């Protein structure tokens, strides 16, 4: 599961 990095 990847964390948010926009």
């Amino acid at each position, epitope marked *: 599961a*990847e964390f*948010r990095h926009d």
Partner: antibody
Amino acid sequence: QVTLKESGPGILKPSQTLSLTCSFSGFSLSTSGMSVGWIRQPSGKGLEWLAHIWWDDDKYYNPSLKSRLTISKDTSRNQVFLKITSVDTADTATYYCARRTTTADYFAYWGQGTTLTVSS
Amino acid sequence: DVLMTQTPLSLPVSLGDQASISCRSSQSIVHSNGNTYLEWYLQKPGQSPKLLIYKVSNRFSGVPDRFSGSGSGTDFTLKISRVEAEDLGIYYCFQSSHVPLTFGAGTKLELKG
């Protein structure tokens, strides 16, 4: 100026519910790219990330606390909340809230922390 | 979960010397967007942790240039040159690529006697 200020009940008995508040200023959770997370530290021990909330309501949780955690926000009041149900001694810790943004993607700002003792 | 293993956990140094801290992730922390989200924090006694380095090698503004991050793959290093007393405390690496976000156990920079 950007500031974060944690508050909590100070002491709880095992089985009670912990309700933490992170009151912030200097930014708004209505602002695109904004987020706040909670991190705790048992004394003399290391840091553990707990939960995270984004300006658009996306929430992330650490599976290590199972269904015990709930994060929420009131952008109107500049507050982020963390609820932890069924506390036990292992929840004794200092709790920090900290900010990250999409354009400054790192925990540059932390609160001073709120300390919790769980004991019977 | 990604395990972050730091070495050593206790690091004695003479003032003015260089300290080197190792941090290894148990699996890749290269995000799908191509960046490696490895951060270093310093916690001084009685204080909240403070940011030093982000994305492996980028110094946060206001951080002295004596702090420098480097690495490749899953092996990371924080270098502290010309150590000053104010640098003493606990250093943590941290990956934010994957959920749950995870810290290393912390390395205490201490004095030689």
